[PDB]
Design a protein around this ligand. Structure first.
Ligand SMILES: Nc1ncnc2c1ncn2[C@@H]1O[C@H](COP(=O)(O)OP(=O)(O)OP(O)(O)=S)[C@@H](O)[C@H]1O
Ligand SMILES: Nc1ncnc2c1ncn2[C@@H]1O[C@H](COP(=O)(O)OP(=O)(O)OP(O)(O)=S)[C@@H](O)[C@H]1O
Ligand SMILES: [Mg+2]
Ligand SMILES: [Mg+2]
Lengths: 265, 265
């Protein structure tokens, strides 16, 4: 069937590239055959991750699953400068070509608005939208009243997904949308509550369902230079910590909630 | 003579808007007369902050310092769609008009690339560049080998060119560039590996490292009201006090000094 996952949030630093790289890496290890498309043309975090994996595995001469990384150009930083049309054309090539060869297409998007970004939301089966536990992030999903503090209306990014559905209702056939809270820390109780309320109210208005959070964790960020993740450090030498264990736990919970239980452990 | 501060990092979620809103608020309370310009045309986090302050102070009928918030349009979300030229024209109007009426101009920038963004880097006296303690963020400053540092990177160049553009108007008073680490958490190994590259890069690219902020609810918790710690006297209290407050106003102060604004703490 070939399912397409779009990781999205207009907000910067929501954790989009981090959830995408760990999604890919988990799927790979569930036998699946993944394609990774990175639409952050300049930053190219997912793309950079896997260039580092490539270069690393190579040097150490060990072997591990690699996705099928796909660029729009021979130089995307450069392509970022050409007009929308050329970017879209590039996307075209990369998407079409991945439809062929892969079971999942993982698309990581950038933290603003663009043609290719909008195009990706319209061709997606699942939209995973990680966010920070914070009203600053929440403001791209829904507008809250300063005095009352009631939610008040959907907001910029909500609309972006709402239109990526109307664009899937020309080719007729239901889009899962999951918002999960990422980089969770210790206390934050009062704020985590006020936020959790609006989060729910908004779900009813806009049609997403909340997934399980990840917590702030060095291991989610520490291995980027090598292009590795926790899913690569398994005992299957191997030093396992309580933290590593909590982490692969959360990832697993996450995987299930996205209905990818078929590919965990 | 009317100094201009540009908060910058191409990386999303580096903390730009959070450092800018607290800079403005600290300056205000040091007697200064600030202008706030937000070039994140869609998100408009700093602009949203102060619309909430406006609406909140109004409702509670209390009085507190407000900056001079400046829009490029009557609708910037809309302006985000017009061509570069029109955006730049809008900037023009807003910058020029703030040169007149203010001692500091605080410009918050978005987490990608744009004309107005590049224009702001060329007219800046100080560039405050907050980043996450993370190699993912670091990759927009400098490229590291999968054993170590090889070259400057996308955003380093953006500032390096905003200097060459200040070297037409020959400002003997060069541009100060400060990179500080933001959202610091508890536990060491990653914070060290990073701190090394951070220094090496400084020598190559010409910035100096400033004191970090730590991950703290209070830095994020008051956004809906458009308030900050600097507002939390006995009269203003929408939120119960924590021991955290003192450590917070501490870091802010340390920060302020390091940017040579000791005059306003
Ligand atoms: N659960 C987590 N635990 C620890 N670190 C995290 C976690 N999630 C994200 N990070 C780090 O947080 C920062 C933001 O994460 P990214 O995934 O890079 O965000 P993003 O949404 O891709 O941002 P852009 O720049 O808008 S794409 C990075 O420095 C990551 O290293
Ligand atoms: N020191 C801090 N403590 C706690 N939360 C923080 C801190 N710094 C930033 N945040 C939160 O981190 C997220 C990113 O910070 P922002 O200031 O929004 O980043 P940004 O650089 O404006 O990213 P763009 O503009 O969206 S790219 C927001 O949810 C803030 O509420
Ligand atoms: Mg990214
Ligand atoms: Mg912002």
């Amino acid at each position: 069937e070939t399912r397409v996952i779009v990781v999205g949030n207009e907000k910067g630093g929501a954790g989009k590239s981090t959830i995408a790289v760990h999604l890919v890496t988990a799927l790979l290890y569930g036998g699946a055959k993944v394609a990774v498309i990175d639409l952050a043309l300049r930053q190219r975090t997912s793309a950079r991750f896997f260039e580092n994996r490539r270069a690393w595995l190579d040097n150490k001469k060990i072997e591990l699953p690699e996705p099928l990384a796909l660029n729009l150009s021979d130089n995307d930083v450069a392509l970022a400068e050409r007009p929308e049309e050329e970017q879209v054309a590039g996307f075209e090539a990369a998407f079409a070509r991945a439809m062929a060869e892969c079971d999942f297409i993982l698309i990581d998007t950038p933290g603003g608005d663009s043609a290719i970004t909008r195009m990706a939301h319209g061709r997606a089966d699942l939209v995973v939208t990680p966010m920070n536990d914070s009203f600053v992030d929440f403001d791209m999903l829904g507008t809250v009243d300063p005095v009352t503090l009631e939610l008040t209306k959907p907001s910029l990014y909500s609309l972006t997904v709402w239109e990526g559905r109307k664009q899937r209702a020309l080719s007729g056939q239901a889009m899962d949308w999951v918002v999960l809270r990422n980089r969770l820390a210790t206390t934050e109780a009062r704020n985590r509550k006020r936020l959790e309320d609006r989060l729910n109210a908004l779900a009813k208005r806009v049609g997403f369902r909340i997934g399980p959070g990840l917590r702030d964790r060095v291991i989610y960020r520490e291995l980027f230079p090598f292009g590795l993740t926790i899913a690569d450090l398994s005992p299957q030498p191997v030093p396992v910590s309580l933290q590593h264990l909590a982490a692969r736990q959360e990832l697993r919970a996450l995987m299930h909630s996205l209905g990818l239980s078929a590919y965990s452990g």
